[PDB]
C-alpha cells in the first residue's frame, strides 16, 4: 500500500503542514454538539437537520454504476442542505493557513467542497458531514481561538496587525478575550447568540510560532527552506517545459 | 534602491502614523505588529462624511432609499482606522474613495482618450485620388484637406445646404493630427497638424519608429468625448471614416458621392485602419476599441513614459499603473462586473511605492548578478532560460515577502492576498523581462512568483485568483493554437486572462519592461506610440499615475461635459 | 503506439488490445458517427409551438403579442406532422432522414440526412431545415392565411432574425450557434454539462465518456492534437474517458466506501509507481521523495484518470454536483505536493478548477456545474480533461441544484437520450 | 419535373435533359466535392512567415516586436517543409491529404484530409491543423528555443487568440471564421467576390457559376430551399448560374455589340412570352399590357438569368465592375415597368442593388464590388441571385478598381486557381 508523504520540508513548518494534511492533530479543547451548531448558525442547537431533497432511500436513485459503487455520506443519504464552516487565520503565526485547511478537508473527509482564499477558507458539505469537519477544526491545534475566527462573512483580519491582547481583528466582534478565555457569543455571520461559547485559552505567541503552517522571515524563513523552494522550482520547470513539448 | 526604500517608508508613515481625517492615527511604528481599533465607523473619514450626508439628503429628496452605511451587515465601514494612499513616485495623498473611477475624472478621461482614438492611413486614400480621378496630391492639397478635416471631424458640414452641426464648445477635444515617416513630407505640412517624430522622440527612438513605419503617413484621430460617452468604442472608427470621407469630397472637389468615394470608405474603415483593440466573442460581446480588445503591447505604446524616460523600471511601472487602473477598475470592475468594483485591487500597484520598492531592489540584484543586464541596452541582456527566471523571480518574491513581513503596515496596506500577489508577481515579471529583453520570460517570472508566494504563506489570492496562474507557467511557451502568444500581443481576451483582476496591468508592465530594458521606441505598435505623443490630449499619458492623483484631488478637467446646454 | 483494453461502466471488458490511434475522432467510425449524428439532429417542442401559437408568447422572455391567437392542435396531430416534416427534411426518398415523435406528441426528434451536413459548412442546416419543415407543415396542415404567416413562423423560430439565435423559439440541438464560439474549432465544445448528463440518463461514467468524445473532437478540430500532441490527447481520452484497463472504475471501487480525494491520490501514485510510469528521482534531506515521470504523456493520462476517479468518489459521496470544482483543484494540487510532478494538463486542470470554483460559488457569473462547457470562458482552458468530470458531477447530484438537468435540458434529454450511441458511448466506441 | 440543357461558358452543350433536382447542393456530387474541398483547403504564405520571423512584424497592422528576430530560410526549404507539413496534417498514410509548394516556395496549398471535416463541426480544422503543422515543422526544422516558441508561433497564427481570427497571420482559406456569420447557415456565403474572380481566373461566366454554387449551398444550409422553395432555388441556379439552355450566353451574344440594360430586358421578355412563361393578363386603356406569370418560379428564373446577362453586357461594355450595382437595380426596376410583373426575387435583387449602389458610392461603408459577399450586411438579402453578378462584374474589370483581385486575393488565386473543379465549375457540375 502506498503511504502518502504529503509535503516537503524539514522545518517545523514542514512538520505542521504534514500534520494538517494527514489529520494527525492534537486535540486542545472541547466544543459541545449544541455549542458548535450554535456558532455555525444554520439551525437551532439540538434540532433535526433540515433537508434540501428527500432521503436517497425515499426517492430512489438513477441506475448508475458510480452511485452503486460509492457510498453516500450520512448527510447525503438524509438529503441535508449543503451548509458550511468558514475560518479566517492570522498571518501572524496562526496555526492554520487556508490551503492547508483545504488539504486537511480533501484528504480526511468524504464529500467535501473546500475553498481557499487569502482571507478565508471554507468547507461546504452536507450539514451533518460538515459539522464533523467543523468539530475537528475547532477542537484541534488547527484553530487557535485568538489568531483565528469562524467567520461566514466580513472576514477581514488575516493581514491586519493584531490587537494588543493578541486577538485578530474582527469587524463584527464575534469573539474576544473574556477572563483569559476566548468567548464566541455570536454566530459565524455575527447574529448574537443566547449563549456564550467558551473556546478556552489562546496559544502564547511562542506556541503559535512552533505550531504554525505559515513561513515568516522572523520565525521560520521561507528563504532558508531549500527543499521546498526546490519543490516549487521542479514543478515550475516541468510545467513550463511540458507546455512547450510534453516529453 | 535606497531612495525608493526610503520613499516606501515615508508612505507607510503617512498612511499609518500620521492622523487622517479624525482617525486618531498619530504616532506609532511602521514595523510594529499591533493596532488599536477605535471602531469609529465611517465618520472618521472626511469623504465618507460628505458621502453619508449627500446620501441622506438625496434619499429624502427622491423618496426612495439610497446610500446609508448602516445597511452594511454587522457594523458600518471603518471599524479599523480608515487611512489614505500616496500615489507612488509622488507626494499626492489621496482619499481612498477618490480613486474609484466613478469618483475620478482623470481615470474616466484616460479611458475616453483611448476609446475615442483611432489611426487611419493616408497613403491608400491618396493613391485612390491619383488612380481614379487623376488628382495630384501635394503638401498644399493635404494642408487644405487637414483644415477641412479639422472643421468636419467634430461634427460640422462641408457639403450640403441646411445642415445642423455639433456645438463646437461641446466638442473642443476633437481634432486630427498627422504623423509621417517621410521627413520631407513632414517639413512641408503646416506644423499645427503635425506630430513631429523628430521633436517628440530621442534620435534613437525616432529612427526605430521611422524604420518601422517607413515613408507612410497616418492620421491620429480623436473624436468627441461627448460622443464616445453617448455611444461606444465601436463608434470611433466609423466616426473617423465618415468625416475623412466628407473632407476628401470637399477638399478635392470630387463628386459628392461617387464610386471612388467608396474606396476611401473601405480604406478608412478597414484597409488602412488601426484600432486600439479588436472585437470580443459572444459571451463578452463588444465591438472594437473596448478595453478587452486592447493588447498589452498597445497599452504600453499609448502610455508615453517610454518617450520621456530612460529608466526601464520607471517606464514599466507607469504602464503597470495605467494598466491596473484601466483593466481592473474600469474593464473588469465595471464593464465585466460593476458595483463597488475593484479600486484597491488596482491601487495596490500604483500607490505607496510598495511595488516600486520591490522592482528597484530587483534592478539592483540583476545588475549585481548579471553584469548590468537591467540597465538600458541591448547587448547587455541575458538569454532567457529557466535558470535565469528561477533566480530572478525567486529572489524578487522572497524580498517582496520579507518586506511585507518586516513592515506590518505594508501587509495591512495590501490587505488582500490578490493585491500582494499582483505586487510580487509584477516585480518578478518586470525584473525577468528587464534582464532578458524577453516578455514571455517576464511571464514565466510572474507565474513562478505566484508559485513561491503560495508555498510561503499557505495562501495566494481570492477564490478564482490563480486560474491563469496554474495554467500560467505551462502556457508561457506553448505554441498550441489557443495557448501560444508573445505577451506583447496578449491582452484581456487571451483566454486564461479573460476573467480575473490583478493580472492584466502586470502583463502590460511586463510587455513594456522587455522593451524599456532595451531602450526600445515601442512595445508592439509604433503607430500608437506616435499617435499619443501629443500634449494636446486631455490626459497626460507620460505620467498616468500622477494623473490619477490629479483626479483624486479634483484638479483634472475632463472633456465631454454638457453644462453649456443644461439648466444653470 | 499504445494499446489499451476498453471496459464499460460496470468494469466489464469490451475490447482488448485497442491501439489508441484508432480512438482518434479522425479515425474512429463510431466517434465520427456520434459527431455526424450530433450535427444533423435537433429537437422540436410541438407543445411549445402550440402554446406560443395560442397565447402569442413567442420571441423571448416576457414576450407576448396580443390579439393574434392561433389555436392549432399540434400535439394531437404529431404523427401526421412528423410524416410531413420527414418529407420536407429529406433530400431523397429512402435516405437517412429520420423523424420520431417523442413523449406522446409533445416533441420531435429530427435527424436531417447526412447529405445536408456534407453540403453544409457546419451543422446549422439541421436547425434551419428542421424549423423550416415544421413551419411549412404547420402553415399547410392548419391553413394559416398569409397575414398570419409571421405569427406561425415565430412560434417556431422565435426572434430570429432580429436575434442571432432562435430566441424564444422551439427548435434546438445539443450544440449552440457557431457565433457563440470563443475559439476556432470550438463548436463541439459548446455543450452544456446538463445536456450531457440528460442524454446519458445520469449514468456518471457514460456522462464523462460522452463528454470526453465531444471535448477531444473539439481539441482535434482546434488543431490541439497534431504530431506528438495526438498521442498525448488520445492517452487522456482512453484512460480518463473510456475506462482504459478498468483503472478508473477499479480506483472508484477501492475508494467507494471510505475514500476521499486524499486516498484516490494514493491509488493513482501507487499504480504509477507499480506500472513504472514514475520513479523517485531524488530523496530530499527530510526524506521527501521527488519523482520524475518516465513517460510524460502517460503520467498526464494517470493524472487525468485520477481527476475523474476523484470526482466520482467526492461528488459520489456527497451526491452533490458542486464538489467537482474543488475535486479538480485539490486532486491536482495535492498530487503535485505528493510527488513533485505536474498535475493534469501541467496545471491547466487545477487552473480551470480555481476559476470554476470561484464561478460556481460567487456573484460574478457562471452558476452551478451544470451550466459549464468546454466553450465557457471559465472552463475552456484545459484540453478536454476537466469538463468530463463536470458532466459526471452533474449526473451524480441527488437534488442540491436549482438549475437541474430537467430545467435546462429536459427537451434534450427526452429527445437525444433515446439514441443508443449517445446513451451508451463507451459501448459505441468499443463497437458493442 | 423540370429539366434543362447545360451549356458551358462558350455556349457548347455539356449535358442534355438534366433534372434540376440533380443540381441541388444536397444531391450533386460535384457541388459536394467543391464544398468539401473548399472546407478543407487553406493557403500558407511561407514568404509571409519568413519576413515576420525576421522583422518581428506579426499580429496585425502596424505591429512589430523589436529584438526577437529569427532568421529562417523557409522559402529555400519549402519542399522539405511541405513534406513535414503533410506528415502532420495527414490522418493516415495515403489518405486525401495534399500539400503543394506554390510559386517557387513562397506559398503552400494545404488540403486537410476529409476525415478532419467529417470529425469536425465546421471547417476551421483546415486552418488550425494547417497552422499547427507549419508551426510544428518550423520549430522542428530550425530548432527554435522554447523561449522563442511564442515568436515562431505568432509568425504563423498572428494575434490569435487575443483576436478571434489569425489577425496578421499567414494562414487563410477562402472562407472566414464562423463567428463572422450574420445568420444561420451563412458560412458558405461569406466569400469575397474578389476571391471568386481570382479562383476562376477572371472568366466572367465561371465566376458567376462558382458564386452561384456557394450562394445556393448557403441558401440550402439556411433552410431557404425547403418544399416548393427547392424548385424555386434550383430553377434560379440552373438558368442564372449554369447557363441553362444557353439562354444567358445567347442573350449576351445578341446584345454584345450594341446592347444595353434596356435591350437585355427586351431579350428576356420576348423569350418569356415565346416560351409561354408569361402572358398578357389585361390591356389597360392606354394600350399598356399587364402580364401575369403562368409559372412564377420559372418567371423568377428568367428574371435571374436576365439580371446576370445584363451585368455581362453593362459591365462588359464598360470593362468596369462598378456598373453591377446599377445593373442589378435598373434591370429589375425597368423589367417591372415593362411587364407589370415582379423583378427577380420579388424585389429582393433590386433591393440588394439599391443598398449596394449606395454602399459602393458613398462615405458610409462597403467598398468596390470586389469586397461584397452573400454574408455582407449590404448584399445578403437576395436568395443567391445578386452576388453571382457581382463576381462576374469584378471578373470583367479592366483596371478601374483600387481593391483589385490581386490586392485581396493573390494568394487565394495562386493556390485555388489551379484546381479544375474551381476554374471550370459549370463543367464540374455537369460532369466534365
Ligand atoms: C462576497 C465576496 C464573495 C465574492 O464573490 N466577492 C466578494 C464580494 C465583495 C464585493 C464587496 C462589496 C460589499 O462589501 O458589499 C465587491 C466590492 C464586488 C462588488 N460587488 O462590487 C468585492 N468583493 Ni471581494 N473585494 C476585495 C478583496 C477581497 C478579499 C478580502 C480579504 C480580506 O482580508 O479583507 C477576499 C478574498 C480573499 O480572501 O483573498 C474577498 C472576499 C469576497 N469578495 C467575499 C466577501 C468576503 C467577506 O465576507 O468579507 N474580497 C480584496 O482582497 C482587496 C480589495 C477588494 C475589493 C474592491 C477593491 O478593490 O477596492 C473587493 C470587491
Ligand atoms: C455597411 C457596414 O460597413 P462596412 O461595409 O464598412 O462593414 C456597416 N455600416 C453601416 O451599415 C452604416 C450605416 C449607417 C450610416 C448610413 C445610413 S443611411 S442615411 C445616409 C443618407 S445620405 O444623406 O448619406 O444620402 C458597418 O458595420 O459599419
Ligand atoms: C464568467 C462570465 O459570466 P457568465 O458565466 O457568462 O454569466 C463573464 N464574467 C466574468 O468573467 C466577470 C469578470 C469580472 C468579475 C470578476 C473578476 S475577479 C461574463 O459576464 O461574460
From TrEMBL, chain A:
Enzyme Commission number(s): 2.8.4.1
Q: Which GO terms describe its molecular function?
A: coenzyme-B sulfoethylthiotransferase activity
Q: What class of enzyme is it?
A: transferase
Question: InterPro entries per the record?
Answer: Me_CoM_Rdtase_Fd-like_fold, Me_CoM_Rdtase_gsu, Me_CoM_Rdtase_gsu_sf
Q: In which pathway does it act?
A: One-carbon metabolism; methyl-coenzyme M reduction; methane from methyl-coenzyme M: step 1/1
Q: Per the UniProt entry, what are the Gene Ontology biological process annotations, in alphabetical order?
A: methanogenesis
Question: Which cofactor(s) does the record list?
Answer: coenzyme F430
Amino-acid positions noted as binding coenzyme F430 in the UniProt annotation, renumbered to this chain:
118-119, 154-156, 158
What highest taxon heads this organism's lineage? Archaea
Keywords of the record, alphabetical order, are:
Methanogenesis, Transferase
Q: Which reaction does it catalyse?
A: coenzyme B + methyl-coenzyme M = methane + coenzyme M-coenzyme B heterodisulfide
One Pfam family of this protein, by short name?
MCR_gamma
Q: How does it assemble?
A: Hexamer of two alpha, two beta, and two gamma chains.
Record family assignment: Belongs to the methyl-coenzyme M reductase gamma subunit family.
Q: What is this protein called?
A: Methyl-coenzyme M reductase subunit gamma
Origin organism is Methanosarcina acetivorans (strain ATCC 35395 / DSM 2834 / JCM 12185 / C2A)
TrEMBL record, chains C, D:
Please name the GO terms of the biological process aspect recorded for this protein, alphabetically: methanogenesis
Q: Which UniProt keywords apply?
A: Methanogenesis, Transferase
Q: What class of enzyme is it?
A: transferase
Q: Which cofactor does it need?
A: coenzyme F430
Give every Methyl-coenzyme M reductase beta subunit C-terminal domain span.
185-430
Recorded E.C. number(s)?
A: 2.8.4.1
Q: In which pathway does it act?
A: One-carbon metabolism; methyl-coenzyme M reduction; methane from methyl-coenzyme M: step 1/1
Q: In which domain of life is the source organism classified? A: Archaea
Entry's Pfam families?
Answer: MCR_beta, MCR_beta_N
Q: Name one GO molecular function term.
A: coenzyme-B sulfoethylthiotransferase activity
Keyword Cell membrane applies: no
> Key word Transferase present in the record?
yes
- Indicate the segments forming the Methyl-coenzyme M reductase beta subunit N-terminal domain, all copies: 2-183
Q: Which InterPro entries match?
A: Me_CoM_Rdtase_asu/bsu_C, Me_CoM_Rdtase_asu_N_sub2, Me_CoM_Rdtase_bsu, Me_CoM_Rdtase_bsu_C, Me_CoM_Rdtase_bsu_N, Me_CoM_Rdtase_Fd-like_fold
Reaction catalysis annotation: coenzyme B + methyl-coenzyme M = methane + coenzyme M-coenzyme B heterodisulfide
Q: Which family does it belong to?
A: Belongs to the methyl-coenzyme M reductase beta subunit family.
Subunit field text: MCR is a hexamer of two alpha, two beta, and two gamma chains, forming a dimer of heterotrimers. Hexamer of two alpha, two beta, and two gamma chains.
> Which named protein is this?
Methyl-coenzyme M reductase subunit beta
Q: Which organism is it from?
A: Methanosarcina acetivorans (strain ATCC 35395 / DSM 2834 / JCM 12185 / C2A)
Amino acid at each position: 500500500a502506498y503511504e502518502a508523504q504529503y509535503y516537503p520540508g524539514a522545518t517545523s513548518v514542514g512538520a505542521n503542514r504534514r500534520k494538517h494534511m494527514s489529520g494527525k492533530l492534537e486535540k486542545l479543547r472541547e466544543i459541545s454538539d449544541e455549542d458548535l451548531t450554535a456558532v455555525l448558525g444554520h439551525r437551532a442547537p439540538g434540532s433535526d437537520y433540515p433537508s434540501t431533497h428527500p432521503p436517497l432511500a425515499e426517492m430512489g436513485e438513477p441506475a448508475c454504476s458510480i452511485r452503486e459503487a460509492v457510498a453516500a455520506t450520512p448527510g447525503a443519504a438524509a438529503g441535508d442542505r449543503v451548509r458550511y464552516v468558514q475560518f479566517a487565520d492570522s498571518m501572524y503565526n496562526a496555526p492554520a493557513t487556508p490551503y492547508f485547511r483545504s488539504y486537511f478537508a480533501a484528504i480526511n473527509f468524504r464529500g467535501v467542497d473546500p475553498g481557499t482564499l487569502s482571507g478565508r477558507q471554507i468547507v461546504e458539505a452536507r450539514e451533518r458531514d460538515m459539522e464533523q469537519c467543523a468539530k475537528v477544526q475547532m477542537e484541534t491545534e488547527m484553530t487557535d481561538p485568538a489568531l483565528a475566527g469562524m467567520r461566514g462573512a466580513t472576514v477581514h483580519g488575516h493581514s491586519v496587525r493584531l490587537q494588543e491582547d493578541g486577538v485578530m481583528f474582527d469587524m463584527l466582534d464575534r469573539r474576544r478575550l473574556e477572563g483569559g478565555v476566548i468567548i464566541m457569543d455570536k454566530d459565524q455571520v455575527a447574529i448574537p447568540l443566547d449563549r456564550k461559547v467558551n473556546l478556552g485559552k489562546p496559544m502564547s505567541s511562542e506556541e503559535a510560532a512552533k505550531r504554525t503552517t505559515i513561513y515568516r522571515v522572523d520565525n521560520v524563513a521561507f528563504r532558508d527552506d531549500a527543499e521546498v523552494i526546490e519543490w516549487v522550482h521542479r514543478v515550475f520547470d516541468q510545467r513550463t517545459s511540458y507546455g512547450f513539448q510534453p516529453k | 534602491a535606497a531612495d525608493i526604500f526610503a520613499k516606501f517608508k515615508k508612505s507607510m508613515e503617512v498612511k499609518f502614523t500620521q492622523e487622517y481625517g479624525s482617525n486618531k492615527q498619530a504616532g506609532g511604528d511602521i514595523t510594529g505588529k499591533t493596532e488599536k481599533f477605535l471602531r469609529l465607523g465611517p465618520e472618521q473619514d472626511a469623504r465618507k462624511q460628505e458621502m453619508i450626508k449627500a446620501g441622506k439628503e438625496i434619499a429624502e429628496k427622491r423618496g426612495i432609499a439610497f446610500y446609508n452605511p448602516m445597511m452594511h451587515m454587522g457594523a458600518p465601514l471603518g471599524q479599523r482606522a480608515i487611512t489614505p494612499y500616496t500615489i507612488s513616485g509622488t507626494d499626492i495623498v489621496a482619499e481612498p474613495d477618490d480613486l474609484h473611477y466613478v469618483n475620478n475624472a482623470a481615470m474616466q478621461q484616460m479611458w475616453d482618450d483611448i476609446r475615442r482614438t483611432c489611426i487611419v492611413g493616408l497613403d491608400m486614400a491618396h493613391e485612390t485620388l491619383e488612380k481614379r480621378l487623376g488628382k495630384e496630391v501635394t503638401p498644399e492639397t493635404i494642408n487644405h484637406y487637414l483644415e477641412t478635416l479639422n472643421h468636419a471631424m467634430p461634427g460640422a458640414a462641408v457639403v450640403q445646404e441646411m445642415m445642423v452641426e455639433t456645438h463646437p464648445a461641446l466638442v473642443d477635444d476633437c481634432y486630427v493630427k498627422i504623423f509621417t515617416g517621410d521627413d520631407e513630407l513632414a517639413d512641408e505640412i503646416d506644423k499645427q497638424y503635425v506630430i513631429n517624430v523628430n521633436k517628440m522622440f530621442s534620435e534613437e527612438q525616432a529612427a526605430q519608429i521611422k524604420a518601422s513605419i517607413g515613408k507612410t503617413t497616418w492620421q491620429a484621430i480623436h473624436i468627441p468625448t461627448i460622443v464616445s460617452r453617448t455611444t461606444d468604442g465601436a463608434q470611433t472608427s466609423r466616426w473617423a471614416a465618415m468625416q475623412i470621407g466628407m473632407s476628401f469630397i470637399s477638399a478635392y472637389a470630387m463628386c459628392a458621392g461617387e464610386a471612388a468615394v467608396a474606396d476611401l470608405s473601405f480604406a478608412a474603415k478597414h484597409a488602412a485602419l488601426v484600432s486600439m483593440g479588436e472585437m470580443l466573442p459572444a459571451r463578452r460581446a463588444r465591438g472594437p476599441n473596448e478595453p478587452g480588445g486592447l493588447s498589452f503591447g498597445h497599452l504600453s505604446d499609448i502610455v508615453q513614459t517610454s518617450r520621456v524616460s530612460k529608466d526601464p523600471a520607471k517606464i514599466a511601472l507607469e504602464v503597470v499603473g495605467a494598466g491596473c487602473m484601466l483593466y481592473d477598475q474600469i474593464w473588469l470592475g465595471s464593464y465585466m462586473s460593476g458595483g463597488v468594483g475593484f479600486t484597491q485591487y488596482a491601487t495596490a500597484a500604483y500607490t505607496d511605492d510598495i511595488l516600486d520598492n520591490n522592482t528597484y531592489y530587483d534592478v539592483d540584484y540583476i545588475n549585481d548578478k548579471y553584469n548590468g543586464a537591467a540597465n538600458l541596452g541591448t547587448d547587455n541582456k541575458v538569454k532567457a532560460t529557466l535558470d535565469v527566471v528561477k533566480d530572478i523571480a525567486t529572489e524578487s518574491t522572497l524580498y517582496g515577502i520579507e518586506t511585507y513581513e518586516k513592515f506590518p503596515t505594508a501587509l495591512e496596506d495590501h490587505f488582500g492576498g490578490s493585491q500582494r500577489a499582483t505586487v510580487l508577481a509584477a516585480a518578478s515579471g518586470v525584473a525577468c523581462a528587464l534582464a532578458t529583453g524577453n516578455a514571455n520570460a517576464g511571464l514565466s517570472g510572474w507565474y513562478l512568483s505566484m508559485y513561491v508566494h503560495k508555498e510561503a504563506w499557505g495562501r495566494l489570492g481570492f477564490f478564482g485568483f490563480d486560474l491563469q496562474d496554474q495554467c500560467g507557467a505551462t502556457n508561457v511557451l506553448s505554441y498550441q493554437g489557443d495557448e501560444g502568444l508573445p505577451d506583447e500581443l496578449r491582452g484581456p481576451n487571451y483566454p486564461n486572462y479573460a476573467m480575473n483582476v490583478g493580472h492584466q496591468g502586470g502583463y502590460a508592465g511586463i510587455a513594456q519592461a522587455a522593451h524599456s530594458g532595451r531602450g526600445d521606441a515601442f512595445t508592439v505598435n509604433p503607430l500608437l506610440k506616435v499617435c499619443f505623443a501629443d500634449e494636446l490630449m486631455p490626459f497626460n499619458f507620460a505620467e498616468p499615475r500622477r494623473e490619477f492623483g490629479r483626479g483624486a484631488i479634483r484638479e483634472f478637467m475632463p472633456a465631454g461635459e454638457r453644462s453649456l446646454v443644461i439648466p444653470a | 503506439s499504445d494499446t489499451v483494453d476498453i471496459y464499460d461502466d460496470r468494469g466489464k471488458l469490451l475490447e482488448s488490445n485497442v491501439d489508441i490511434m484508432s480512438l482518434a475522432p479522425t479515425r474512429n467510425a463510431a466517434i465520427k458517427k456520434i459527431i455526424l449524428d450530433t450535427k444533423r439532429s435537433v429537437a422540436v417542442s410541438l407543445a411549445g409551438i402550440q402554446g406560443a401559437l395560442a397565447s402569442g408568447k413567442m420571441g423571448g422572455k416576457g414576450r407576448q403579442i396580443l390579439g393574434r391567437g392561433l389555436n392549432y392542435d399540434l400535439v394531437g396531430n404529431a404523427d401526421a406532422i412528423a410524416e410531413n416534416v420527414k418529407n420536407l427534411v429529406q433530400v431523397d426518398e429512402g435516405d437517412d432522414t429520420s423523424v420520431k415523435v417523442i413523449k406522446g406528441g409533445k416533441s420531435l426528434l429530427i435527424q436531417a440526412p447526412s447529405s445536408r451536413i456534407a453540403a453544409g459548412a457546419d451543422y446549422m442546416s439541421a436547425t434551419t431545415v428542421g424549423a423550416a419543415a415544421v413551419t411549412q407543415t404547420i402553415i399547410d396542415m392548419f391553413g394559416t392565411d398569409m397575414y398570419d404567416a409571421p405569427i406561425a413562423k415565430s412560434a417556431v423560430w422565435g426572434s430570429y432574425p432580429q436575434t442571432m439565435d432562435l430566441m424564444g423559439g422551439n427548435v434546438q440541438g445539443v450544440l449552440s450557434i457557431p457565433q457563440n464560439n470563443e475559439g476556432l474549432g470550438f463548436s463541439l465544445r459548446n455543450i452544456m454539462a446538463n445536456h450531457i448528463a440528460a442524454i446519458t440518463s445520469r449514468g456518471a461514467m457514460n456522462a464523462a465518456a460522452l463528454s470526453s468524445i465531444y471535448e477531444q473532437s473539439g481539441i482535434f478540430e482546434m488543431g490541439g492534437a497534431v504530431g506528438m500532441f495526438e498521442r498525448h490527447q488520445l492517452l487522456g481520452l482512453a484512460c480518463q474517458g473510456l475506462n482504459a484497463n478498468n483503472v478508473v472504475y477499479d480506483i472508484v471501487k477501492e475508494n467507494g466506501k471510505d475514500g476521499t480525494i486524499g486516498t484516490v491520490i494514493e491509488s493513482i501514485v501507487g499504480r504509477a509507481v507499480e506500472d513504472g510510469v514514475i520513479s523517485v528521482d531524488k530523496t530530499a534531506p527530510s526524506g521527501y521523495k521527488f519523482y520524475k515521470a518516465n513517460d510524460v504523456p502517460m503520467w498526464n493520462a494517470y493524472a487525468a484518470a485520477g481527476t475523474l476517479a476523484a470526482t466520482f468518489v467526492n461528488c459520489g459521496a456527497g451526491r452533490a454536483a458542486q464538489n467537482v470544482s474543488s475535486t479538480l483543484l485539490y486532486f491536482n494540487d495535492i498530487l503535485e505536493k505528493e510527488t513533485g510532478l505536474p498535475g493534469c494538463d501541467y496545471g491547466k486542470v487545477q487552473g480551470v478548477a480555481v476559476g470554476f470554483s470561484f464561478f460556481s460559488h460567487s456573484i460574478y457569473g457562471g452558476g452551478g456545474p451544470g451550466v459549464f462547457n468546454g466553450n465557457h470562458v471559465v472552463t475552456r482552458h484545459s484540453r478536454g480533461f476537466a469538463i468530463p468530470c463536470v458532466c459526471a458531477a452533474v449526473a451524480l447530484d441527488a437534488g442540491t441544484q436549482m438549475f437541474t438537468i430537467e430545467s435546462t435540458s429536459g427537451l434534450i434529454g427526452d429527445v437525444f437520450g433515446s439514441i443508443e450511441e449517445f446513451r451508451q458511448p463507451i459501448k459505441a466506441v468499443a463497437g458493442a
